[PDB]
């Protein structure tokens with residue numbers, strides 16, 4: 001998750 | 008009448024959107040170039056992947072969203088991302104030739120371009136219909152950012168663990184929208200506006216299932232998946 005890091 | 012709190016919510020969402028939507032479209036320069044069978048796939052993948060990033064940024068600013076569990080955040084964004092891309096694109100959508108106009112000929116996307124990304128009329132037909140429907144509602148920007156927010160914080164998404172919490176946020180958002188319409192949206196723009204807006208959210212659900220079907224079928228071809236971005240594969244092509 002790079003989604004998790006964009007959060 | 009809107010409460011201070013409700014006014015606070017709107018101000019935040021307009022600032023969130025304005026931080027994350029660039030109407031000069033200056034970044035589009037960075038994408039793999041557009042070519043006018045699957046010649047538009049690299050450019051449109053780049054556009055979508057960028058837009059996912061912007062949607063995440065917006066979603067982060069929604070009052071309450073950051074306070075959800077990390078897992079629930081991911082689930083809400085994975086299921087909503089394409090729907091908000093479709094909502095947010097209405098701002099570049101034009102009814103003169105049924106296209107998305109992003110400032111210059113190179114960044115003008117019509118029906119044939121969307122088909123050169125690999126998609127069929129079964130998606131394209133309802134997508135344009137949706138864009139005409141949404142454009143004819145002449146939404147205030149206040150209504151436009153609230154609809155995007157309500158879209159994102161949907162308690163009824165498959166995988167959602169803390170649905171009561173998600174619902175608490177959605178309702179504050181919904182009542183805000185409702186109260187804005189009554190006291191700030193003049194008639195007959197206000198006439199049946201809320202129900203029509205809610206109806207748009209249903210359309211998106213349907214549009215989403217048709218995007219998912221065509222995305223699975225296309226990105227099964229590994230040559231096509233190669234042309235995608237890591238974030239796209241993570242948000243759309245995961246699980």
Ligand SMILES: C=C1C[C@H](C[C@H](C)[C@H]2CC[C@H]3/C(=C/C=C4/C[C@@H](O)C[C@H](O)C4=C)CCC[C@]23C)OC1=O
Nearest residue numbers: 051052054055058092093095096099107116121124
């Ligand atoms: C690789 C693709 C292409 C497909 C995109 C679909 C068919 C649609 C949805 C919204 C459409 C468009 C949206 C246009 C913009 C430009 C601007 O308004 C910002 C907004 O975020 C946006 C994506 C025009 C081209 C086809 C798009 C991306 O989904 C995918 O996974």
